[PDB]
Amino acid sequence: NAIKYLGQDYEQLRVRCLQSGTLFRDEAFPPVPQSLGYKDLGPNSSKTYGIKWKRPTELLSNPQFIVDGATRTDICQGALGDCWLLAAIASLTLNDTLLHRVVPHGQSFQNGYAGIFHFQLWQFGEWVDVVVDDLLPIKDGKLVFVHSAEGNEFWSALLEKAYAKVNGSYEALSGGSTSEGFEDFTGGVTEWYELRKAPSDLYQIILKALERGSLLGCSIDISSVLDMEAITFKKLVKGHAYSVTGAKQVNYRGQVVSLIRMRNPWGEVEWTGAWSDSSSEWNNVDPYERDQLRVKMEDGEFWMSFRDFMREFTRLEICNLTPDALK
Ligand SMILES: *[C@@](O)(C(=O)NCc1ccccc1)[C@H](C[C@@H]1CCCNC1=O)NC(=O)[C@H](Cc1ccc(F)cc1)NC(=O)c1cc2ccccc2o1
Ligand SMILES: [Ca+2]
Ligand SMILES: [Ca+2]
């Protein structure tokens, strides 16, 4: 069903390379300075100091495409300002059907390997199949850009490369809107909410949207350019895309408290207030709810009360696949 981006035929290219005993080299997006960028990542930029291009099979003994599932902990931002895109990838992982379309799971660095991978993207109103070779930007032996918490897992590095490819360069991804990423992974359409002027049933809207596999993100407005990427006292990040990854009501101090879970695509730096990983609120919830919801791990993911979320965050976006035809 997906059309072939630039006519490149993943399976025909793979089979040819396997037959000729060679590794795929992508003519359409070569491992050259212009694929990194033009200005901040351009040929004469100090920020490209030391960057080389290496396949995962040139880096480690047993590179893997997917380890323990393709999940949101596999999305840890690198040195590129594509937080909006990475938040969208992390949200995508919660919708198992769309995840398996965007990320074809039958790819490997072992059996069948020819140095070529492919992904599906929604582009200009249609699904397209995008190939990449697996040369990736490396500095000091590590991925420069997105990487997994598992150092030998490469699906998200390669998906980010495919998204750079359709944009012409990695630097073209620097600075953006989460809604673009949401839509390019789902074919859905984004609704935007100003949390100061939110409907009274917003929490129920969020619950139903997560349940149906929509993709959700949130952010804190900046007051000025100097506010960009500022870290607040309670370790939220301003001007920065977060994934909304969960929502649950718990019984707490005789009331029902609505909680919301979100993930910083840095994979680190989390809220320190109520419902944070080591907060004392967890001592007064049910032991089963505490076990189900709370994970003490610096992974970028944490809970907040909905009250605090509405106090600290400024906007929420919800990308629904079929917003006029729900269940
Ligand atoms: C992320 O916070 C990010 O990638 N942080 C890690 C990082 C920062 C700086 C350099 C490397 C890695 C983005 C940081 C921006 C990116 C550009 C450089 N300096 C920055 O502070 N933040 C964004 O991309 C915001 C994300 C956002 C999403 C939703 C929302 F409601 C508000 C913010 N977007 C921009 O900064 C931005 C968006 C956009 C659209 C069109 C034109 C220009 C433009 O800039
Ligand atoms: Ca994984
Ligand atoms: Ca955490």
Helix (H, G, I), strand (E, B) or coil at 110: coil
295: which 2 tokens? 């994970």
The angstrom resolution of this structure is 1.6
Is the CB of residue 83 below 6 angstroms from any atom belonging to ligand 1? yes
Domain boundary among 132, 159, 187: 187
Q: Which phi and psi angles does 197 have, rounded to 5°? A: -130, 50
For 101-241, list the strands marked E by DSSP.
116-123, 126-133, 136-139, 142-143, 189-194, 215-219
- Which numbered ligand comes closest to the C-alpha of 73? 2
* 120 and 256 belong to one structural domain: no
* 88 and 218 belong to one structural domain: no
The H-assigned helical ranges of 23-133 are 33-36, 83-92, 96-102
The annotation places the binding site at: 77, 82, 284, 286, 291
Separation between Cα atoms, residue 25 and residue 322, nearest integer Å:
38
* 201 and 289 belong to one structural domain: yes
Task: Provide Rg for the chain, Cα atoms.
Answer: 20
Whether 218 is a known active-site residue: answer no
Q: What is the β-pairing status of strands 255-263 and 136-139? A: unpaired
- CB–CB of 158/136 below 8 Å? yes
Separation between Cα atoms, residue 215 and residue 178, nearest integer Å:
10
b/e sequence 298-323, b meaning 16+ C-beta within 10 Å: ebbbbbbbbebbbebbebbbbbbbee
* 62 and 201 belong to one structural domain: no
* 37 and 155 belong to one structural domain: yes
* 124 and 208 belong to one structural domain: no
Amino acid in position 95: N
Q: Which phi and psi angles does 30 have, rounded to 5°? A: -70, 160
- Which of the residues 95, 118, 240, 320 is marked catalytic? 240
The HSE-up count of residue 310 (CA atoms within 13 Å, CB side) is 16
- Which numbered ligand comes closest to the C-alpha of 221? 1
Domain boundary among 154, 187, 220: 187
* 108 and 205 belong to one structural domain: no
Q: Which phi and psi angles does 297 have, rounded to 5°? A: -160, 130
* 63 and 198 belong to one structural domain: no
Amino acid in position 301: E
Separation between Cα atoms, residue 208 and residue 89, nearest integer Å:
20
* 303 and 320 belong to one structural domain: yes
Q: Which phi and psi angles does 177 have, rounded to 5°? A: -110, 130
Q: Give me the domain span that covers residue 198.
A: 188-327
Angle at 140 between CA 134 and CA 144, to 5 degrees: 50
Q: Residue with the nearest Cα to atom 32 of ligand 1?
A: 239
The H-assigned helical ranges of the chain are 10-20, 33-36, 83-92, 96-102, 155-167, 178-186, 202-212, 287-293, 306-312
* 127 and 240 belong to one structural domain: no
Domains in the chain, number: 2
Whether 118 is a known active-site residue: answer no
* 5 and 113 belong to one structural domain: yes
Domain boundary among 136, 164, 187: 187
* 21 and 140 belong to one structural domain: yes
